[PDB]
Symmetry: D2
Subunit: 179 residues, 4 copies
């Protein structure tokens, strides 16, 4: 009765809008729907309940016994703990829809999406349009000073000129570490 759907892809691939589109179908069928998003839409009075959380554990603190469809956006902000949470919810008969990043800016697998992709019934990898060539993009390009971020530049970075854009694998560049 319950299953998991996984939506992934780079930044700017429309993951969040796709998650919302599928939750909206829940509303037209008069189902109860909620979405969880990291802390740090209605039709005929029935509405998507949105819920900000700091930790994946907060999900089970909510009463979900009457909820048909559970969304979870930006899953890369959580741990592999969210994997067992999502399996349990799907075994308790919920439709569960998770969205988040497949890779980080370096092109490295972004926990916990690998495992979610492996255990989910459905997987949809969305692609954006490369800011360079206009072909299908697959990667998130991080720029620091109009230049390709380095493999070892940290994610917390104070006062830096920082931008993100989608790129194809060919146009994606991770600059080498310094020494």
């Amino acid at each position: 009765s319950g299953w998991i759907e996984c939506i992934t892809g780079s930044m700017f691939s429309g993951k969040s809008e796709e998650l919302i589109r599928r939750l909206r179908r829940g509303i037209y069928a008069k189902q109860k729907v909620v979405v969880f998003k990291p802390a740090i839409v209605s039709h005929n009075g029935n509405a998507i309940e949105a819920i900000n959380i700091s930790k994946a554990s907060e999900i089970m603190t909510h009463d979900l016994t009457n909820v048909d469809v559970i969304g979870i956006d930006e899953v890369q902000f959580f741990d592999d703990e969210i994997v067992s949470i999502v399996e349990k919810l799907s075994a308790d008969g919920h439709r569960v829809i998770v969205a988040g990043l497949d890779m980080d800016f370096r092109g490295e697998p972004f926990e916990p999406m690998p495992k979610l992709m492996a255990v989910s019934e459905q997987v949809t990898k969305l692609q954006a349009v490369c800011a360079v060539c206009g072909s299908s993009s697959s990667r998130t390009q991080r720029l620091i000073n109009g230049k390709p971020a380095k493999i070892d530049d940290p994610i917390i970075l104070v006062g830096a000129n920082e931008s993100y854009e989608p790129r194809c694998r060919a146009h994606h560049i991770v600059a080498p570490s310094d020494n």
Copy 2:
């Protein structure tokens, strides 16, 4: 260089939201994007130009020489004429995205989506959630007086109690003609 993408499915399957999601990817790649819709969204100053039209012929009256991506929503409101228009635009190097109904309320193929599906590079049939059983829906149920519309009830209907909801083929009912 140009191609066609077709988005179809019943009412309430999210066709319009999916068309917008794909056009938004155009904006993040700094492409120029427009959408046409029947008469009767920005990021960094670059915006989807929306354009209401009465007739498919109006499309060619617009200057489209710098437009990367052309959307066309609710194509069932137009004729098979839109087929050659969309082939020409795709041959002139545009990415073209059409959305509309696959079938009418009777379950009959809704012109001009059949031909567009046949000539398009990509086809995506979206499914909603059946208002009866909660399975994947495929059809638009028309109700008149809380009852299934008849195969021959007209679409223009004055003063009637009229509703639409998505249903699976099993729960979709077209009532017989009277005599």
Copy 3:
């Protein structure tokens, strides 16, 4: 309980192999499966029954009361009659899988695939690889004397040097009529 799945695309896109792959899943689940193909695979003793036919009408002459899954390959060799046949079979609780051409060599919609795409629950447009550039192909290129067939060359053609290959829309060429 019954539905339709449509598999389409150009020649050489693997439609026939995809139809067989999906019918084989029927066998591993111990379902009874048949495939119809135009006239003019087992596992643990349970086998796909293959059936050659001249006319779509022959389908209803077969006893199908115990058949879970009905395949129909090369549907372009049949008429729009096959549309109501496939709707009836799906309404009688069968899973029905149709494969055939979306367009002919001219790029024109190939009856009866448009209507089938419109009324089917699922649609899968397969793409081959362009014999010229190696990108995703969408069209069937007909060659006569190492040259692009003409829009009006007939399909019955005696003694001619005739070849077919998949191409992208850009590399697909229909030569003009003579006068």
Copy 4:
């Protein structure tokens, strides 16, 4: 120029047949194609070169400079080492198609498919048909003595009555460990 396509799903979902179908499209476009499979199809004289291997490292020992398309079947028989091998081949301009199991019989993510799904441009999760209910399956059911394998039963098992069949999550059962 190069990319990765990932084909996954349970046993009996047709992963191997889908991998072959996509490699065959390479042949019709006159591309050179090879497939690697664990040790322990032609058209107009141009043929898929099949190659049995014990170790993922053997792949780089082969001369691949003229190969357009590289297949790799049953990737669960290899290590995460195959991840960097597949990224390198895709960065050297090859189309790479990997197939293998998403989960093991226990429902646990099957290395190295998680990471491959995360770094691949395309992901296709195929589904079989549940041997119990006939709905879409997602899991591989292991049976020992007509009974559900236990979470801790090993995979090497001498003289046991052992069968596998695809099941939906609901009908999939992992029996508890003994003590």
